[PDB]
Amino acid sequence: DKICLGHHALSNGTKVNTLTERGVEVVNATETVERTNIPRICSKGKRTVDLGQCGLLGTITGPPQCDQFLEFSADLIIERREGSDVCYPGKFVNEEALRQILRESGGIDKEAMGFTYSGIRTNGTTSACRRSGSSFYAEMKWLLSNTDNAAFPQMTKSYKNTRKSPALIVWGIHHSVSTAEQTKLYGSGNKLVTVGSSNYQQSFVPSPGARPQVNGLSGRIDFHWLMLNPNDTVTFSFNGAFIAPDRASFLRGKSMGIQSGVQVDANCEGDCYHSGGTIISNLPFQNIDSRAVGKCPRYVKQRSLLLATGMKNVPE
Amino acid sequence: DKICLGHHALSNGTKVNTLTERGVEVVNATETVERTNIPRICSKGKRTVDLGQCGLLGTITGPPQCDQFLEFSADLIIERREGSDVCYPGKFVNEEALRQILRESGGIDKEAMGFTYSGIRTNGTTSACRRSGSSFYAEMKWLLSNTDNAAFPQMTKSYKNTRKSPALIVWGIHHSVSTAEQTKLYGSGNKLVTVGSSNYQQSFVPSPGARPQVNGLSGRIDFHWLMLNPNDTVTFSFNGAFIAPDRASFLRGKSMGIQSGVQVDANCEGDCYHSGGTIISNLPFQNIDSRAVGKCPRYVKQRSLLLATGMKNVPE
Amino acid sequence: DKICLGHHALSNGTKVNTLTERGVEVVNATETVERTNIPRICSKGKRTVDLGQCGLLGTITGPPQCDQFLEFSADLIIERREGSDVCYPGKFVNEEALRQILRESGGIDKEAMGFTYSGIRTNGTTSACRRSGSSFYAEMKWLLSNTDNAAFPQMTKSYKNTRKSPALIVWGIHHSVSTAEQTKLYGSGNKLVTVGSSNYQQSFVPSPGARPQVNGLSGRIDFHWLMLNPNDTVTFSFNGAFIAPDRASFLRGKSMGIQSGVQVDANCEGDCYHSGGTIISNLPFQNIDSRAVGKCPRYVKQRSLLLATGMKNVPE
Amino acid sequence: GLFGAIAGFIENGWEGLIDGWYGFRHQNAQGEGTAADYKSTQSAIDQITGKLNRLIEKTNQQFELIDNEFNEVEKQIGNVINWTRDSITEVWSYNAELLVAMENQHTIDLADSEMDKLYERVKRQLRENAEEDGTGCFEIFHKCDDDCMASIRNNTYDHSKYREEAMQNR
Amino acid sequence: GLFGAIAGFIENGWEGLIDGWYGFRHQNAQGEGTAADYKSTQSAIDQITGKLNRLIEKTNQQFELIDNEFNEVEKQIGNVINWTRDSITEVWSYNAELLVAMENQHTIDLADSEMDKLYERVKRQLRENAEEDGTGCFEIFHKCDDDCMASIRNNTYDHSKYREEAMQNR
Amino acid sequence: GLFGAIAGFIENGWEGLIDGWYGFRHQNAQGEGTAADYKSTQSAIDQITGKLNRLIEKTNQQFELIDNEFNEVEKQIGNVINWTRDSITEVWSYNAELLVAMENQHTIDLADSEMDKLYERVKRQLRENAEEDGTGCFEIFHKCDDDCMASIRNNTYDHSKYREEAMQNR
Numbered sequence A, B, C: 001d002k003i004c005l006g007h008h009a010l011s012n013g014t015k016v017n018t019l020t021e022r023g024v025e026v027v028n029a030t031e032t033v034e035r036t037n038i039p040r041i042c043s044k045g046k047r048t049v050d051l052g053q054c055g056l057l058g059t060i061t062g063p064p065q066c067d068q069f070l071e072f073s074a075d076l077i078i079e080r081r082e083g084s085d086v087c088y089p090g091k092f093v094n095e096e097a098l099r100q101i102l103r104e105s106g107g108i109d110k111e112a113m114g115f116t117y118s119g120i121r122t123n124g125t126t127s128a129c130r131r132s133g134s135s136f137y138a139e140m141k142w143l144l145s146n147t148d149n150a151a152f153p154q155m156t157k158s159y160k161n162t163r164k165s166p167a168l169i170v171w172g173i174h175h176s177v178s179t180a181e182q183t184k185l186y187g188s189g190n191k192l193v194t195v196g197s198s199n200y201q202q203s204f205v206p207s208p209g210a211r212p213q214v215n216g217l218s219g220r221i222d223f224h225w226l227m228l229n230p231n232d233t234v235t236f237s238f239n240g241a242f243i244a245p246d247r248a249s250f251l252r253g254k255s256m257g258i259q260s261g262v263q264v265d266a267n268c269e270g271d272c273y274h275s276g277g278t279i280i281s282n283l284p285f286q287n288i289d290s291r292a293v294g295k296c297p298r299y300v301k302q303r304s305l306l307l308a309t310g311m312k313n314v315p316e
Numbered sequence D, E, F: 001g002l003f004g005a006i007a008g009f010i011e012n013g014w015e016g017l018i019d020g021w022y023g024f025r026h027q028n029a030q031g032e033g034t035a036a037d038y039k040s041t042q043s044a045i046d047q048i049t050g051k052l053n054r055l056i057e058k059t060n061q062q063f064e065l066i067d068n069e070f071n072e073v074e075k076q077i078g079n080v081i082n083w084t085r086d087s088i089t090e091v092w093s094y095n096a097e098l099l100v101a102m103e104n105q106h107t108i109d110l111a112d113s114e115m116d117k118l119y120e121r122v123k124r125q126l127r128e129n130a131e132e133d134g135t136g137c138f139e140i141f142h143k144c145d146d147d148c149m150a151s152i153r154n155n156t157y158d159h160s161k162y163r164e165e166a167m168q169n170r
């Protein structure tokens, strides 16, 4: 006598939201927000450099812990909490900008500046930089006065970037523990270091004085830097208190840099990274870490947003 | 003979917009953009501190108008146009960053640094800071040379933060009206103040010279600051021209800071504030002020966006 | 016997995308993303100033190439690659901020500062600034010591902004090629230039030394600036090495500034500009240049996004 | 609307219908009467109020000051801030306009939809005992008193009782 | 589409129909003919052009330079700027893709809708004097000449005149 | 939904229907049987999976670090960065919520739509040889064996063969 139309249904549906309603049950639904973290840095197929105890900026100046990183090459660079940019206590002026440049450099290539010195000492070391006895930053030279209290003569040294890409140049300023010990190392008077490039003009008088003992020492070195363009020249006029560059750094290409405290893993691949690990997912959104970097799902505040993939569930 | 279906209607509808059409009339509609301001700061249930004549940064150094604000506590901090951070003319280096830190500090707790001085004056005052006669910043000390033209000896003073949260440290540099009056106060020669922390390296030589008379005076004080981490130590090597910290500031917790020129009102509650007052609304959007702060509706350029809440109006 | 309903169709439709499907063919479709560039700066109806060889910041100080731009007026300001802010080698401190101020200034009006000098030279020139023989920045004065090695006496000069809008004030610091040639020009000793306004406190000691030869010269001039509010006063205490302002700049109104290497064209109008030209379009999106300025379509990554303007195409 | 009833095959609304959104107006031997349909009125109202509860909420996300109205921040950082804020304003102004427009379209279509569903419900009840006028009216061939109309309004109209009558009256 | 007429119960479109979007093609004793329906064509066109007037506008919101193509700004501020711009690009690229996709869905459904409304209008006119073929055709039992077809196309077809004939022809 | 079939004029779904989404359950002289409709099930599945392929993609847009978890950046720039990131989070959190809600609405309406299209298809096949029950059932007046039901399910039911029988049975 009759024929009837109907549709499928379940006892229990999956609640989802619509424009009109909260928690309408549908036959099937799927998650649009990634919550699953992999607690490893997934680096399968990527030239990876894990800096460990080497600070990124240390790769440019070369304290002992960065000796194996002076000319590295990478698609992916990993900074660690234990990293340190220095041996002899100090810091870089404009540090974070330099980090950003280095994180995406693809690594660095080094080249001799070709500075020759006369009438001064170039062999200056310390117990803070240990390479079987006292040493110094591998890419730098601690310029001193020939003997104690001796005049450090007003010097001029220049370097032309004869390459097709910008050169990264770094120099230090030594701030001694006292006004006396500044005179001992470099002679008395007002020490003035000046630096000039087509993009750049600056000057540096030091400032001796007592800092608290870091690495057992109360002295500091101020590292400074500029990017020297192709065919441009940079000149160093200095009267002392100057840590001279021996080599210059050039950038290899392209990379990504991350910060993390988890292990590297060459068995999984991923393009979205954060300090707790890797987000592997095709979902358009994630609720794991808003500071995730690489190619990521968009970070959203919601734990979950279910997308209906079936009709409304209307049970018996 | 018949039965007819229909729907309700009005003579006049409310115009709204759709994907297809502009100004289609519907039976009923409601506003999604807030335009109603309350011209008071609605602070019901909130620990509120209205700074009035005290500038926020003055709470750290303590000019007379900030005497009742040296250790305040708050959920909501209100800066006023008439506020002033100083008595003796001067300013803070990195001022806005410090304001931002203080706006959300939840207020400040103060603690003695424990500096002891020998062979110098600590009692330095002025007519610009009036507490029944000449005075000085309550949390600072104007360090001078024992007598006129007397040498200010190269000093070392240190302070270790022995607490679980960052300490805020502030010191001033005095720039006198002339090169002479610098020598009168602190003796002749090149005055050098240096400051060193694990996060921090800087130095300060002053600069005497004629500024225009502010508060009747042509001298200036440069206030400077850093955040000293737990267990970290900070050292002050100075040769004169130094306004020493007496107390250190610690941050109590969490607050919100606003700027406004309207009265406080403990009868209304609100979480979205701007200089003209409070936006109380559940609407998702507002067209009152794009710089509104707190928990606010989203600012949009449109005065009005009506949302249909009824069917299309089809009158007789 | 019968009557049939149908709809129109074509052999070939235009593929578009929907929520459900990729490349469904419809009867007609139109582009929502602009790809057509006009390779000219469309300036019909706009007061336009093409700076050519004059750098924007040069309009304030006045090297020879900016002589015809000292008091310009404009709705639209165009900077060119060949532009130069200087004649005598140097740069501005805080340069980009100043550019931004000047790009939307609507041009500048100039006014004499009214400085009078006694016991010094004001006529200082150079071969780098050529106006039929040696010259100097038109809006500045190179202040020197009366004769060689002569003391440059500690001077005070002040200027009150007696107008209803902020005054732009610029001064230079000369850094000579050697410590000797600093003494020759301005006498020996520590040269100190100080500047003080109600918003502002700073100081300047120079730094002689060898820079590389730019324009044939190894000296540099550091240009500095502040915005002096109505009724506020600014004082200049200096001991030498000072390039004094002769005139002050006031901002005329409103403009837009762009950078471009294409020609001006008064036959086409446009409000959206980029270095390659003008985007004329009513489309909501563009894929030409993400740094386009003015009133523009929104930049998007897609080349094309077709919007259906007809029904689905269902051919025979 | 998409379903072609409101501002469609029904000529217009009724200003007398203050009881609810949708209703029946009948004509018979005992005169003329009007009454609201609760069920359809309620489906529309509930769905609309459901839109509202979703939109009329503000987020718990706090934002603080990054610039200063009394003491202007450095120009470079100030311009980046203004540019960023203006960009965000442009995004939300767009979002708000699109949200309201697409909501209004859907509201209007949904209201039109409910009217159509009500219209069809009645047709299915009256199977064979009535015909489509074409203006939103069912011409009833058999005699349907007020009691009979009430049975239609309340889902109790047994078509088989009157079938023989209305069939013959074809 | 959602209404199941276009690419639905109607097999395909007509490439001969250049007059308008929708139309009637009839068959009778006097041969075969075709003509456009103005009213439905116009509802679709107006609603579509209405979408366009809304989208084809640019805002009056001016943006200025915050960086420099000739003289690179400081790296830190430069990277914040680029990150911010890239974030905004990501937002607008998403918005544009979604807007166009949801508009295209609605356009297609709306066109399908208008065809269905036209189909139903004719059914209501022809009440009882015709039947549903199932391909978008009404088989007419009584004799309907070209004059008669024109009355259908123009909303003047009085069903009661031919009712007795077509009823008997059941 | 907007078409009033699912959670509409059909009372509920069938938990026994594991073959597909939509189906026929018949009743006759030979008992009772049930079977899935492939065509409608497939239209819904394809359209839904099409939504998924669009949404389940991530962009190729790379973002880098602009701040530091080990070594805090300067406070002013740090606060601008956080404010900017928080603003973007607010935008995407909104976008995601709206996208999913509007997709879910459309999914549910589309599923309801396909059921309605299937319902109407069968009505057009059975022209005059059946009537609308009103719960999603067609009462068939003539004798329709399992072979006859299969012809309905598979678009081969010739109405004219049984027309005389069912007509008389009116």
Ligand SMILES: CC(=O)N[C@@H]1[C@@H](O)[C@H](O[C@@H]2O[C@H](CO[C@]3(C(=O)O)C[C@H](O)[C@@H](NC(C)=O)[C@H]([C@H](O)[C@H](O)CO)O3)[C@H](O)[C@H](O)[C@H]2O)[C@@H](CO)O[C@H]1O
Pocket (backbone or CB within 6 Å): A124, A125, A126, A127, A128, A134, A142, A144, A175, A176, A177, A181, A185, A216, A217, A218, A219
């Ligand atoms: C060699 C001598 O005449 N006196 C020795 C004392 O200096 C020494 O006292 C210790 O000094 C330590 C610092 O020593 C260095 C360092 O950094 O390790 C040694 C470097 O050769 C010297 N380098 C240069 C280029 O001058 C360096 C430098 O002067 C300062 O670091 C700059 O501020 O100092 C350290 O402070 C120890 O804590 C301290 O006891 C004693 C110790 O046995 O031996 C003396 O022979």
Ligand SMILES: CC(=O)N[C@@H]1[C@@H](O)[C@H](O[C@@H]2O[C@H](CO[C@]3(C(=O)O)C[C@H](O)[C@@H](NC(C)=O)[C@H]([C@H](O)[C@H](O)CO)O3)[C@H](O)[C@H](O)[C@H]2O)[C@@H](CO)O[C@H]1O
Pocket (backbone or CB within 6 Å): B124, B125, B126, B127, B128, B134, B142, B144, B175, B176, B177, B181, B185, B216, B217, B218, B219
């Ligand atoms: C006491 C003395 O020997 N001479 C007095 C004159 O100095 C005084 O002239 C007035 O000086 C005023 C500035 O005075 C102070 C101040 O700031 O109020 C007084 C402070 O004690 C002094 N503090 C310290 C720590 O040295 C302070 C300081 O030197 C400068 O502010 C730093 O730049 O100066 C003010 O300039 C008046 O305008 C001026 O007339 C006259 C006035 O009666 O009395 C003398 O006894």
Ligand SMILES: CC(=O)N[C@@H]1[C@@H](O)[C@H](O[C@@H]2O[C@H](CO[C@]3(C(=O)O)C[C@H](O)[C@@H](NC(C)=O)[C@H]([C@H](O)[C@H](O)CO)O3)[C@H](O)[C@H](O)[C@H]2O)[C@@H](CO)O[C@H]1O
Pocket (backbone or CB within 6 Å): C124, C125, C126, C127, C128, C134, C142, C144, C175, C176, C177, C181, C185, C216, C217, C218, C219
């Ligand atoms: C006039 C004199 O006693 N000696 C002349 C030499 O100085 C000159 O050597 C050339 O010097 C050139 C620099 O000359 C200027 C300049 O900038 O053009 C000349 C300006 O009058 C002088 N201005 C002031 C205000 O002092 C200016 C200034 O000293 C420096 O620029 C500041 O650093 O210098 C240039 O360096 C040439 O390369 C160099 O050969 C010779 C050349 O014929 O003639 C002498 O009579």
Ligand SMILES: *[C@@H]1O[C@H](CO)[C@@H](O[C@@H]2O[C@H](CO)[C@@H](O)[C@H](O)[C@H]2NC(C)=O)[C@H](O)[C@H]1NC(C)=O
Pocket (backbone or CB within 6 Å): B291, D068, D069, D074, D075, D078, D079, D082
């Ligand atoms: C950033 O925008 C603010 C406004 O949102 C600008 O401040 C306004 O400036 C105008 C004219 O200069 C004044 O009339 C208003 O009083 C100001 N309003 C506020 C709230 O401050 C500010 O100038 C802009 N920043 C920069 C660097 O131009």
Ligand SMILES: *[C@@H]1O[C@H](CO)[C@@H](O[C@@H]2O[C@H](CO)[C@@H](O)[C@H](O)[C@H]2NC(C)=O)[C@H](O)[C@H]1NC(C)=O
Pocket (backbone or CB within 6 Å): C291, E068, E069, E074, E075, E078, E079, E082
């Ligand atoms: C910010 O992005 C711009 C591009 O939008 C970068 O500038 C480009 O840099 C590439 C390679 O360095 C050059 O080939 C182009 O000529 C540049 N384009 C423009 C418009 O300037 C810029 O390098 C980025 N900023 C930073 C700090 O990396």
Ligand SMILES: *[C@@H]1O[C@H](CO)[C@@H](O[C@@H]2O[C@H](CO)[C@@H](O)[C@H](O)[C@H]2NC(C)=O)[C@H](O)[C@H]1NC(C)=O
Pocket (backbone or CB within 6 Å): A291, F068, F069, F074, F075, F078, F079, F082
């Ligand atoms: C900007 O936001 C970050 C978090 O996204 C803040 O850093 C966190 O600070 C809290 C409390 O200070 C710590 O418990 C976390 O360890 C920090 N998280 C990270 C990822 O760094 C940071 O303080 C904010 N910036 C400023 C200037 O306040």
Ligand SMILES: *[C@@H]1O[C@H](CO)[C@@H](O)[C@H](O)[C@H]1NC(C)=O
Pocket (backbone or CB within 6 Å): A010, A012, A013, A014
């Ligand atoms: C229905 O209820 C049971 C209770 O245990 C639950 O586990 C199950 O997940 C529910 N079904 C669905 C499809 O969500």
Ligand SMILES: *[C@@H]1O[C@H](CO)[C@@H](O)[C@H](O)[C@H]1NC(C)=O
Pocket (backbone or CB within 6 Å): A028, A029, A030, A031, A309
């Ligand atoms: C339900 O959806 C999930 C996605 O989470 C999918 O894996 C599966 O194919 C679906 N299952 C059924 C029975 O439809």
Ligand SMILES: *[C@@H]1O[C@H](CO)[C@@H](O)[C@H](O)[C@H]1NC(C)=O
Pocket (backbone or CB within 6 Å): A230, A231
């Ligand atoms: C740099 O100068 C040299 C001339 O020695 C030339 O060969 C080279 O092409 C120049 N490169 C650029 C980028 O100007």
Ligand SMILES: *[C@@H]1O[C@H](CO)[C@@H](O)[C@H](O)[C@H]1NC(C)=O
Pocket (backbone or CB within 6 Å): B010, B012, B013, B014
């Ligand atoms: C219709 O017109 C009157 C004219 O005074 C106006 O006041 C009223 O608000 C209108 N009605 C509605 C519902 O908008």
Ligand SMILES: *[C@@H]1O[C@H](CO)[C@@H](O)[C@H](O)[C@H]1NC(C)=O
Pocket (backbone or CB within 6 Å): B028, B029, B030, B031, B309
């Ligand atoms: C119309 O909408 C308003 C919201 O502005 C609401 O307060 C009211 O309940 C509605 N009135 C009617 C008669 O529907």
Ligand SMILES: *[C@@H]1O[C@H](CO)[C@@H](O)[C@H](O)[C@H]1NC(C)=O
Pocket (backbone or CB within 6 Å): B230, B231
């Ligand atoms: C600081 O050092 C003291 C040792 O005196 C220790 O008790 C405390 O836990 C330390 N706190 C931190 C955060 O390292």
Ligand SMILES: *[C@@H]1O[C@H](CO)[C@@H](O)[C@H](O)[C@H]1NC(C)=O
Pocket (backbone or CB within 6 Å): C010, C012, C013, C014
């Ligand atoms: C259909 O095909 C031809 C092949 O030459 C192509 O040129 C034409 O553009 C197509 N038609 C449409 C309307 O896209």
Ligand SMILES: *[C@@H]1O[C@H](CO)[C@@H](O)[C@H](O)[C@H]1NC(C)=O
Pocket (backbone or CB within 6 Å): C028, C029, C030, C031, C309
């Ligand atoms: C098709 O759309 C275009 C927009 O690109 C428009 O210019 C034209 O009027 C339309 N043509 C037809 C035949 O509909």
Ligand SMILES: *[C@@H]1O[C@H](CO)[C@@H](O)[C@H](O)[C@H]1NC(C)=O
Pocket (backbone or CB within 6 Å): C230, C231
């Ligand atoms: C500046 O001061 C003068 C008094 O000489 C006064 O006329 C003028 O109105 C003042 N302007 C402002 C903005 O304070």
Ligand SMILES: *[C@H]1O[C@H](CO)[C@@H](O)[C@H](O)[C@H]1NC(C)=O
Pocket (backbone or CB within 6 Å): A120, A121, A122, A123
């Ligand atoms: C470093 O070099 C100098 C030569 O200038 C030499 O006298 C000195 O002994 C050297 N120092 C060491 C530790 O070898």
